[PDB]
Amino acid sequence: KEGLRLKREAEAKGDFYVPAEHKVAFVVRIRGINQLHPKPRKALQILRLRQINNGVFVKLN
Amino acid sequence: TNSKGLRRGTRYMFARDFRKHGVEHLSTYYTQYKRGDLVDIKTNGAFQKGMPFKAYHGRTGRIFNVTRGAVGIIVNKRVRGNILPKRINIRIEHIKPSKCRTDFLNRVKSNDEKRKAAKSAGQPVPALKRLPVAPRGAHTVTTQNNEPELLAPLRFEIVA
Amino acid sequence: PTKALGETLNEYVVVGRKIPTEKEPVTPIWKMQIFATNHVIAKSRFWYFVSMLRRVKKANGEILSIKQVFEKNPGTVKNYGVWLKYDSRTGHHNMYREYRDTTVAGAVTQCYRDMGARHRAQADRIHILKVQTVKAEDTKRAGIKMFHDAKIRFPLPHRVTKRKNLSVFTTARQNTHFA
Amino acid sequence: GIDINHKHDRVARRTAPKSENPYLRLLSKLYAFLARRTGEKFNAIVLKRLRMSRRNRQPLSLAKLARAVQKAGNENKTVVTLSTVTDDARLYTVPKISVAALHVTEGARARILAAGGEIITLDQLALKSPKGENTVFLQGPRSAREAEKHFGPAPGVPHSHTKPYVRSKGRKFERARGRRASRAYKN
Amino acid sequence: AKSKNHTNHNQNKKAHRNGITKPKKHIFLSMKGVDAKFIKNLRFSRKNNKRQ
RNA sequence: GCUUACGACCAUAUCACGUUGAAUGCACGCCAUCCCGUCCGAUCUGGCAAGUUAAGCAACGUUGAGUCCAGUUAGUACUUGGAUCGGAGACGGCCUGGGAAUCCUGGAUGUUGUAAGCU
RNA sequence: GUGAAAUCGCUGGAGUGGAACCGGAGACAGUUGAUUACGCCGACGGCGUUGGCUGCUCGUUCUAGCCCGACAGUGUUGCGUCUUGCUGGCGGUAGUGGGUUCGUGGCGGCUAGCGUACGUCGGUGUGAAAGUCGACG
RNA sequence: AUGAAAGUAAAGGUCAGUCUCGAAUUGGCCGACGUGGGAUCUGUGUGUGCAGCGCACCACGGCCCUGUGCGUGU
RNA sequence: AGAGGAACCUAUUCUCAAACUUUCAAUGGAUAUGAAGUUGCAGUUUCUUUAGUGAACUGUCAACGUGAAUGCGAGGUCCAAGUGGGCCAUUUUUGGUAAGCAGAACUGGCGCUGUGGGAUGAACCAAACGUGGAGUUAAGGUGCCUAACUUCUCGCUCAUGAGACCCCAUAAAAGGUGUUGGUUGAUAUUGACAGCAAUCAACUAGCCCUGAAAAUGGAUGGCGCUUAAGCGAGAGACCUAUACUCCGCCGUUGCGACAAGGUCGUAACGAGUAGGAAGGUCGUGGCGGUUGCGUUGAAGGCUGAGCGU
């Protein structure tokens, strides 16, 4: 409700209310486990995405 | 195959910088080095004694010995699947203090001081942790005297 | 590469600006009209064009707003002129094209399909410089102008009708002429 | 498919003594029960050392037992060892020692009993201290073997003091080239 | 029948298979290779400090 | 506002031409018995104080050359990763992120430490 | 003494279009089992689990059109700063009112595999034997 | 154990003295060295903490035997 | 290559460098990010200083209390096999006119490896494998071969064998008044060109055409396809892996329960040449012992009902 109210209030006077950038994300691995470079491979392992259709929550920063 | 002399391929690595040849300034010799300090290695071509090997140029090491005009440094070197802590005796001219450790020491000093001040003054213990830069927060942008400017792609012009 | 996927591309108005810094506490606000399949593509294309025009990229900039634009009156027919720039296999060209549609988004979708049909040009090689509504007397393409007649009339000469939900074989006689 | 490594999935372990000694197997059974039920790491240690191989149970010395008991507070504690307790000829005075062990040599047993001590077995320790209370756990020196002297950096490597495998000892047996600067070099 | 054929093809993979082992942490404790005069004075200093 | 001795950074400090320079000082300067060194008291060395800011040196001046900083060049050149992307190929663009350097334009022309002294 | 395999002849059955053999899945031939409750099988319902297809209904976001007012234009009917149409932005929204978006939404319909909170029932089998049923094949 | 060999051959820690203040000497106590880490054990608070004794083992040192270079004397 | 004062001087100018450079990225390399730390107090030194002046060390000294993200158990020793002909690909790159040629760099593969697709193929695209089932898909496809539409929308193309999908299985310089779009400059209702109401000219780029010749008869895979079953932009649905989700069973690994060299539970997992280990109430022949069968038929031989992966 507050987000919508602020947005509409800014629109009324012709300003721009910029909402806060998202802080959480969902990541899903969609590619297989073969023919992968070392750097993306280790990054996926660190994110715990070691299989197709594996999903995790990630704190965006 | 290549020859295996000490100074193979160091044509530019061991050269002086443009308009920086000549007499070596004396702060190099006035700097203080103590065992346990971290130093960057950057060969100075003007001094041919106590020169580090080209493999160690641009690496950081920890001092383990301090002689009259040189220091012993422990520098990590990768050899196949192990990292060897090699020991090298380098003269002061090829050495420079490393600021990375001093910054951390300053941060530790600041943390201890802040904790002590908070505890003495009865304040709650402060947050003394570095945190990654978080996504930007919500804010309002005003268009007063800043009206949006409508942009369009530009046509192709034959710039002969 | 960017593709004009989707029936009837959508239209978005994207407003953004370079993130203020100490030397520039207030920065100009830029606005663009984008035609894309969805708002993610709209934002990406906005940054593409804004980075082409001004020294700013997505990293140093931010999006103040992005809002879909809907045709005011989709119950009226209009003539749309499209100024575009595109890349051929050999060089760069500017084109002006005309379409008749009830929506500007529909006209731009027609433009993309027509460019693909007649010049084998993909969406990644087309820039829509401008789209506007032109008056009937201001059109300059025969295909469009031929429909600016109040007494327009024509039959459907050779109509081949497809049977939909019934057997392949029939004894019926097929007729292609309907007077 | 999942991106994992199976190289270290299996860990070699002993779930029972390799020995066919029925009494050793029974002791392993008893202390497996004790470790599982009491849940004491002391019992777990005793179980592991019961299942260990004789290489890892090197003989202990009566002198080491005496030193352990002569420490402040260890006078009335029970010394627990799964190594053989041997007699030391260099030890002149034997204090009162209470020891639970697998095997005690004749001389060590005689001296311990003469000095007023007591020797019990591991089954008797299970009854005296089911949780291992008032114990002093000891073992022999594991690295004090002749074989261990031959382990380490190769003999012909700088700063290496590894014992070589020589047929005999003398001036004619690997003492000339690479061992003295008079012949080529010395490491 | 040429048989020199040097290459570094499969060497990083072999090196990384068992990980790249970093040096230990006690390596900085040893006083090996330090100035002999400093070492002598350190021995004298340590041989005399009264325990209590 | 200055002078000297010793410096640190080592042209924003260099270079060219010119103006001015209170007081201390620096400097030029006079002499060559002695110490000392030379073909030569030119340099170096020693003993001095008649004379001079002429030069050195300092400050300042110049739409000055150089040096330094910034803008522009330019989100350009180049480039990480992606495509059963376009093209006969050479190559090219798109997606995802990094991102320069000349020409040209504008500005600045040493900062500062210890000791002693002038004002 | 026993008397294997390869190779070979006869009798009966069956296949037989420029190879033959072979794995998977059925069918046929054939072989084999079969004590009210219980076995061996099927069908229809219920429940659990994983589903597949398919409708209504509320709301949310961003937005209109219809309708009203003036202005500008014109692919314009009828008889010219005419009229009727039609379009464009702009200003209104009372009423009416669709698109778009999705919900820690609400109510349905059809139906599959696997298992058995479990029910309602059928085929068969309790000497032979025949038949029938079941499984292999 | 060590040296080619003649051969020689593995006890110090601490406290106090005398002193010709040294490359001296004496006497007690303890006796297989010191420190850090150490499963377990012990005590004591509240799964956890602190404290003590510390096995094996590791790290850093100290002494002792032998060969050898330097170098003294009593 | 000129210019201003034949050469010379001055300020310029066109084009360049693997063994030229003022300047200088992207990728890249290295180190640090606390308890093995920070503050003091209070001792040792024969080193160092004019000097407690420093440097270092020591203490059962005192206090403080874990100082980026994410993931995760870590470390040690010993014994030993096979290998020491490689090859391919994106990118960079040397020799060579080139090569399915020779030589290198990073990474990923094949070798050692099956599976869906590319008609076929060691390496290409998708995806890696216990044994079964249901559902959903990746790459690829849906006129018939062939499971899935002669499905829906807009164009372009007629070729006297058109074209038809990564690697990939060749095509260029140069041309066309074939047709379709665009760019620019003109003339035209004060009536444009042709003949006694739009037109002219030059360009440009899509498809098509010419350039385009080889030997057994032959290849978009084949048949065939022409508002396509071709070329380009798109939309619904649909088909299909040993992949993903769920369900059963076998085993391995980790952990756990139980008075057991055993049973059971639970979660995840299962590719494999050379090679290494483990289990084998798998099999064979002796010996020391033990358990039994046999002229009412042993060994051996031929072959139905079963058991075990």
DSSP string across B74-118:
EEEEEETTEEEEEEEEEEGGGEEE-HHHHHHHHHHHHHHHHHHHH
Residue C132: closest CA among C148, C108, C159, C164: C108
Residue D138: C-alpha distances to residues C87, C159, D66, D92 (Å): 85, 103, 12, 21
Rg, C-alpha atoms of chain C:
22
* Spacing of B32 CA from I297 C1' in Å: 108
Closest residue to C31, CB basis, from B151, B153, B155: B151
Is the C-alpha dihedral spanning C149, C154, C160, C162 positive or negative?
Answer: positive
* Host H or E run for residue B27: helix B27-30
| Region class of D170: left (phi > 0), else alpha (psi between -120 and 50), else beta | left
Q: Is the CB of C70 under 7 A from strand G?
A: yes
**How close does chain B come to C164, measured CA to CA in Å?**
46
Bridging pattern class, strands B70-79 and B60-66: antiparallel
Q: At D78, give phi and psi (nearest 5°).
A: -90, 125
3-state secondary structure labels for all residues of D22-57:
HHHHHHHHHHHHHHHHHCCHHHHHHHHHHHCCCCCC
The answer to whether residue C19 neighbours chain A at the CB level (below 8 Å) is no
Q: Check if the beta carbon of residue A44 is closer than 8 Å to that of residue A51.
A: no
DSSP state, B157? -
Give me the torsion for CA of B5, B8, B14, B15, rounded to 10°: 130
Q: Is the CB of D118 under 7 A from strand H?
A: no
Residue E17: C-alpha distances to residues D7, E7, E12 (Å): 11, 19, 8
Q: Check if the beta carbon of residue D57 is closer than 8 Å to that of residue D150.
A: no
- What is the identity of the amino acid at C86? Y
DSSP bridge partners of B84? B77
Coil, strand or helix: which one is C43? helix
| Region class of A26: left (phi > 0), else alpha (psi between -120 and 50), else beta | beta
Q: Could you please report the per-residue DSSP string of chain D?
A: -B----TTS-----SS-S---HHHHHHHHHHHHHHHHH--HHHHHHHHHHHS-TTTSPPEEHHHHHHHHTSTT-TTSEEEESS-EE--TT-------EEEES-B-HHHHHHHHHTT-EEE-HHHHHHH-TT-TTEEEE---TT-SHHHHT-SS-TTSTT--PPP--SS-STTSS-STBBSTTSS-B-
DSSP bridge partners of D80? D100, D137
Coil, strand or helix: which one is A11? helix
Measured distance CA(B158)–CA(D131) in Å, rounded:
93
Closest residue to B65, CB basis, from E11, E20, E34: E34
The answer to whether residue B78 neighbours chain E at the CB level (below 8 Å) is yes
Tokens of C165: 């939900």
Could you tell me which residues come within 8 angstroms of residue C81 by beta carbon, excluding any fewer than 6 positions away? C96, C97, C98, C130, C131, C132, C133, C134, C139
The answer to whether residue A18 neighbours chain C at the CB level (below 8 Å) is yes
DSSP bridge partners of B86? B75
Q: Is the CB of C23 under 7 A from strand G?
A: no
The answer to whether residue B157 neighbours chain C at the CB level (below 8 Å) is no
Structure determination method? cryo-EM
Closest residue to B65, CB basis, from E18, E23, E35: E35
**Cβ-based contacts of E20 with chain B (< 8 Å):** 78, 81-83
- Is the CB of B66 less than 8 angstroms away from the CB of E18? no
Protein-proximal positions, strand F, CB < 7 A: 7-11, 72-76, 81-83, 85-87, 92-99
Measured distance CA(D79)–CA(D62) in Å, rounded:
11
The answer to whether residue B141 neighbours chain A at the CB level (below 8 Å) is yes
Residue C98: closest CA among C112, C116, C111, C113: C111
DSSP state, B158? -
Protein-proximal positions, strand G, CB < 7 A: 60-66, 73-77, 86-90, 98-100
* Spacing of A25 CA from G51 C1' in Å: 29
Q: Check if the beta carbon of residue B136 is closer than 8 Å to that of residue C38.
A: no
Q: At B87, give phi and psi (nearest 5°).
A: -110, 125
| CB-count burial class (<10 Å; 0-12, 13-18, 19+) for C126 | buried
Protein-proximal positions, strand I, CB < 7 A: 21-23, 28-34, 36-39, 43-48, 55-60, 64-65, 67-72, 75-79, 85-88, 102-109, 125-129, 151-156, 180-184, 204-207, 227, 231-236, 243-245, 252-255, 257-261, 268-272
Tokens of C34: 């984008």
Q: At C88, give phi and psi (nearest 5°).
A: -95, 180
Measured distance CA(C50)–CA(D169) in Å, rounded:
86
The answer to whether residue A57 neighbours chain C at the CB level (below 8 Å) is no
Coil, strand or helix: which one is B150? strand
* Spacing of D27 CA from I67 C1' in Å: 50
Measured distance CA(B100)–CA(C152) in Å, rounded:
82
Residues within 7 Å (Cβ) of strand F: A 37; B 19, 25-28; C 1-2, 44-45, 47-48, 51-60, 87, 89, 120, 122, 124-125
Measured distance CA(C92)–CA(C94) in Å, rounded:
7
Distance of CA C58 to the CA centre of its chain: 25
